[PDB]
């Protein structure tokens, strides 16, 4: 793509808003939607087979954009260029719930609040003009992922660190495990991604929300993601931490993510 | 609303406080606290009693009356402060001791989750309904969506509300709607856990600008300014290990100017 | 006050210390500490003994003569334009040998645990006394006669009650846990505060002579020194000191102030 | 002592590279990315950390295109720790949160973070310094032998350059601030054994490598020198045995032609 | 010292200050304190020599000069060196799972105290102690029998950092009432199980100019460097704890300044 002039004026700019619900593992429209199933742990890397529902996967959607009024006789085409976004983790308010079926602070005394959601936070989003380009990488290569998940089967010892053969693209919602795929910094020339990990099992979650924050999506040449086939590609994972039951069974809890994206008309060859 | 020129008498300032609504009734000995928190055994039998959970504070401030083309009050800046941070230096009032097994040491003080948010707009705060457990039965006193469905545990575009009453919208069931609130600025921070150290700052030297990307502040519909907040500081722990929410009141100063509208 | 021109002899600087008022008597062996903290069984029978809780430090500093224009309708006031402030004695918290509960008390071993727990650090610079809001954790707390409080303040005193006001007019007698800065007043004071809670929380303190804070408001006007007085207030709870027998006391540190003032004309 | 003249303009090039971590366990075998299980000595006197139980620095020389002489001058970089996503695994053979109840997630990776990278026109210049000078390092490791009590703090004689991948122990060597005129280095250490790892990743961050005179690293022999270490924390087995876990690091470097004397 | 114009004219010095944590230099525990013992009351409190850290300090000789010229310190780089060593969790450390004799060592944990000073004369100190009844040993420079007011600020209790390795950190800090010709910077993070957090780079330069554009002016052609760098505690299997310290790098850039 040879990139040419920005279009300005009051037809040249549009705004889309979208949500991505989390895919922590439990099925939609059922009582544990937003949670994983209770996590089971292997005894050894050789006998490691995490059941479907017990691990989070990436959220993704393609957003169909408004009609561009293309010039019928020009040797150029217009594309939508994503220039800025707002993104917010929604439902942070729910984490003030320390009554719902939670292990108590003073369990020996059957007293105190629930311990609430605690432990690892993994928060990442991507805005691009094509699917997010992935690097496959796993803690344990010998892990057997379920039929329901999309992974590289028998990926070999090299998949525990960087191996340039082990590539993917985030093409489906809810089936790419977070623990087996990450953004590929050798690609994503037409996507912006942002991620933060805070680990632990008892770490306090820290989340902010405001409707006053905007992130510019322009690269060093002042070019934003260019939406190929007039699609905008949104991706995220938002693990807030763990929910712990009275019997000490632990599940992942996720929150949905809001996106507002401003796009403008860019001429290309 | 089509926005025209700033009218440059044309500047006013309001100060207001919102007291916390942590659950216990006002003018009684536990005002500013919740009642002691009980925990359900399972999501299917989860009915948090009234007084045991915090709700949002809200107030509408009446502004000087104004009025082809109307004048509206435009919120351009604010100061906000969590008041009474000084009270948290109290480690003597009926608190579990650091060395309970020795009947020695200070109180452990207030500890655990901090949830701090405020909003300033020209109409009520627009809410998104979302809950940890959709099967929670909220008490008659609370404003909620009843039988909200599994979908309410994440984002459901059907589950909307507005913050139209003080002390009855449960914090755990409602948050700001980023799909709306074009005429409101909101800010919030959550720090989780039950033994987390509270971190609070206060100064009369910080001003936040409320103008959007187009230089437009909140425009006060019907000459009303809408202030909203929740300020959970953490939990108070008794000797017998019963735990309650403690809240603090919030100060607002808002500066407004007259703006011409079509 | 109607504020006019700034003079550019025009500038002066004062330095001062405020020593902490943690509860134990001055120039006795526990100076800089509270007495060992006791805890009530219920809010109804809560009566914290004098010495076992910290109080605000305040001083009024006398400023140099202003050399007024005898015939002018206007007067000169000192305007505070900037400060440095530093908690002094941070060096002392490297002490883990002085009568402290040990890290491994079951083995009678390791360093002392040193000072840990809540940090409350606030300072105020103004041209009149700091204006305070009364607010308490428990309204039924009976404060001792030595302390300045609103008596029988009632339930509303657990949150914001616009009736419950005061001003910081004496050093070492206004309990930190009962009074805070009033954001509805203090037009002529700048205040700054940080609270970090807990009882095992590590103290975090920084010190440098390279930091200046500007005291000018949004109009370019600093605090104006009425009666040619500069008013300094602070509290610097560093955390708790824990004895081998697990008795716990507040430890405080003194605060340094440098304030740059200039001559302002007013009407 | 290189006389630097004018910037050229064909005159700009970009490289991308990965450095795999060197935490101790051998490449292309089941524990790649990890150390072996850490053993602890009883005293400084009898302290011999076995090969495979401690991390070493990663390093690589990138061959630039061949070029008053011209040199490649490194003006900017992006760097990223990759595979942060894998740390969401709490099922792979990990001690459980509630071991006494055989319940909960794995405890995951926790403890010390040590994150450092260097980009230079010559090998990174090193200062030898150790917690305990009486440590006997294994034959596979590159160390100063019998370094003396002075090697527990700064001793100006104890110098080195990072000239080999995977054999300079992190606990024995660090960047020399007395040298490295032709290298930019950055690091952070967060200690503890139960500390939560904190890691960020984005493709949107650029670091300018120009010094206070507007000069970037000048690539001697048309080579670019990349170095790092990325200890994320410890992996803890059910039997409480602990290993280092590391992650690979991404480098993008932008270079331009500089005229030199 | 009335200051005139800036002015061959620019020089740069580098130096290191080794830590003075308490154990003798050139011996096996160099960089550590001896194992810390704890008193039962403030009355009987007498910390033995080697069990507490002291400030490090050096005077650097500048090219001799000489309407007089003076060396003016305008900027610096400083760096805690040897941060790399803290990745050692094998050297005679209490283990994470001591009941199971398993896990890594717990490594260095607890209070960090990091301070440096750059000036044209010795750092000016305020004497302040946790416990005034502490009897410091003969080897240490203190104010003897300082009294109850020494627990807080007493304006009589002053000193200057004139010797390396004998001013106890816990007895002396920088005096904000003086030090007009010194820039100091410090941070304290307390606790005994706190994680150390240390950063290092060769890319960071700090400007030493005051509000008037004047850097430290080196009286007698001497540059004064001071520091303390307590990283945390080393814990043995038997749970004996010592301070561990790290050396500090200094780069200072100086220019000639005319004075009267
Ligand atoms: C992640 C995973 O799947 N972990 C499972 C695995 O644990 C083993 C691995 O972590 C490997 C990785 O190198 O380390 C073993 O630990 C060994 C290893 O560190 C070794 C040196 O490389 O030192 C110790 O072992 C000692 C000695 O070197 C061993 O040869 C020896 O082995 C003997 C066994 O004890 C006998 O039972 C066997 O009959 O004969 C051999 C001798 O040929 O034991 C020495 C003991 O000090 C480390 O222990 C890990 N092993 C263990 C036990 O943690 O496999 C284990 C089960 O073995 C679990 O499934 C674990 O989840
Ligand atoms: C801060 C302070 O001074 N607190 C002291 C106080 O604690 C009580 C308060 O914290 C109040 C604040 O609401 O809450 C009590 O706990 C109750 C309460 O939360 C209640 C619902 O509002 O739920 C439980 O109580 C159950 C039931 O609702 C009660 O009616 C009941 O009451 C019976 C008692 O069991 C009998 O002993 C009594 O003689 O008869 C009544 C029946 O009318 O108990 C039910 C639970 O078994 C909560 O417990 C606080 N109470 C306690 C015990 O913590 O007063 C206590 C001593 O009572 C301490 O001094 C405390 O420091
Ligand atoms: C939050 C809440 O209301 N929890 C109460 C509930 O707990 C159960 C739920 O958390 C569900 C969520 O899917 O999990 C049950 O745990 C199960 C599942 O994770 C299951 C796989 O889907 O794996 C385990 O069960 C297996 C097997 O699948 C079962 O058929 C068999 O009966 O037991 C097997 C034992 O491994 C796992 O236990 C939760 N059950 C328990 C128990 O925690 O209901 C319980 C009481 O039953 C409590 O009321 C919770 O508070
Ligand atoms: C890192 C290491 O290898 N540690 C092993 C070492 O421990 C000893 C060292 O840590 C030295 C460092 O100076 O201290 C020993 O502790 C002694 C000293 O601190 C001493 C004052 O210098 O005070 C104590 O001892 C007194 C007396 O002073 C001694 O002379 C007398 O013999 O014993 C007295 C008993 O109170 C203090 O204990 C460390 N010793 C011990 C023990 O921890 O050597 C030990 C073997 O002893 C272990 O192998 C450590 O891992
Ligand atoms: C730092 C140090 O050297 N501490 C040693 C010291 O401890 C005593 C000091 O902390 C003083 C400081 O004021 O307080 C003692 O505790 C007392 C006081 O808080 C007192 C009120 O002022 O209240 C308690 O005492 C009451 C009563 O007032 C006493 O007269 C009566 O005998 O006991 C009452 C309680 O039952 C409180 O205990 C500290 N005393 C003790 C004990 O901790 O001296 C002790 C030995 O006495 C140790 O050496 C400490 O390390
Ligand atoms: Mg590329
Ligand atoms: Mg909208
Ligand atoms: Mg006012
Ligand atoms: Mg050099
Ligand atoms: Mg002075």
Numbering used by the authors:
A (entry chain DDD): 22 to 290
B (entry chain EEE): 22 to 29, 32 to 90, 96 to 290
C (entry chain AAA): 22 to 29, 32 to 290
D (entry chain CCC): 21 to 29, 32 to 89, 97 to 290
E (entry chain BBB): 22 to 28, 32 to 90, 97 to 290
Give me lines lifted from the publication on this model.
To characterize the binding of Forssman antigen by ShPyV VP1 with atomic detail, we solved the crystal structure of the VP1 in complex with 10 mM of Forssman pentaose (F_P_) at 1.92 Å resolution. All five Forssman binding sites are identical and located between two neighboring VP1 monomers ([Fig fig4]). In the binding sites without artificial crystal contacts, electron density provides an unambiguous outline of the last four monosaccharides of F_P_ ([Fig fig4]). The intermolecular contacts show that the terminal trisaccharide of F_P_ contributes to binding, whereas the remaining βGal and Glc divert away from VP1 and do not interact with the protein surface. Closer inspection of the binding site reveals that the methyl group of the terminal αGalNAc invades a hydrophobic surface depression constituted by phenylalanine residues of two neighboring VP1 monomers, establishing van der Waals interactions ([Fig fig4]). Additionally, the *N*-acetyl moiety of αGalNAc interacts with the Q266 and F66cw residues via hydrogen bonds ([Fig fig4]). In βGalNAc, the carbonyl oxygen forms two hydrogen bonds with the side chains of Q266 and N268 ([Fig fig4]). Apart from these contacts, numerous interactions involve the hydroxyl groups of F_P_ that are directed towards the protein surface. By the assessment of our ShPyV VP1-Forssman pentaose (F_P_) complex structure, the designated minimal glycan binding motif is the GalNAcα1-3GalNAc disaccharide with few additional contacts to the subsequent αGal. From structural perspective, this epitope recognition clearly disallows branching of the glycan at certain positions, e.g., O3 of αGalNAc, N2 of βGalNAc or O4 of αGal.
In this study, by means of glycan microarray screening, NMR, surface plasmon resonance (SPR), and cell binding assays, we show that FA, which is the predominant glycolipid in ovine erythrocytes, serves as a cellular attachment receptor for the VP1 of a polyomavirus originally identified in sheep. This designated sheep polyomavirus (ShPyV) is a member of a non-enveloped, double-stranded DNA virus family with icosahedral capsids, scaffolded by the major capsid protein VP1. Here, glycan array screening shows that the major capsid protein VP1 of sheep polyomavirus (ShPyV) binds to the Forssman glycolipid, an antigen of many vertebrates and a potential tumor marker in humans. We show that the Forssman antigen serves as a cellular attachment receptor for the major capsid protein VP1 of ShPyV. Thus, our studies present the first example of a polyomavirus VP1 protein interacting with a non-sialyl neutral glycan, complementing the principles of how polyomaviruses recognize their targets.
